[PDB]
C-alpha cells in the first residue's frame, strides 16, 4: 500500500535515480526541514508548478 497523500509546500532539491528519473526532496506543507522526504517523481499529483518553480527560468 502507498503512503498517504500529503500537501506539498515546495521542492527543496532533486536528484536522478539509477534509472535516470527525477526524485524530489519535498518540503511538506505545515512541516519543516526535519520532515523533508525524497520522493520519486511518480509520487507527485499535478505538482508541475512546484517542479517549474524549483527549476526556474
Amino acid at each position: 500500500a502507498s503512503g498517504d497523500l500529503y500537501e506539498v509546500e515546495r521542492i527543496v532539491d532533486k536528484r536522478k535515480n539509477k534509472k535516470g528519473k527525477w526524485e524530489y526532496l519535498i518540503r511538506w506543507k505545515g512541516y519543516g526541514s526535519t520532515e523533508d522526504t525524497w520522493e520519486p517523481e511518480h509520487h507527485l499529483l499535478h505538482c508541475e508548478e512546484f517542479i517549474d518553480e524549483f527549476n526556474g527560468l
Binding site: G3, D4, Y6, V8, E39, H43, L44
Partner: peptide, 5 residues
C-alpha cells in the same frame, strides 16, 4: 499533493 513514503 504527493505520496509520502
Amino acid at each position: 499533493f504527493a505520496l509520502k513514503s
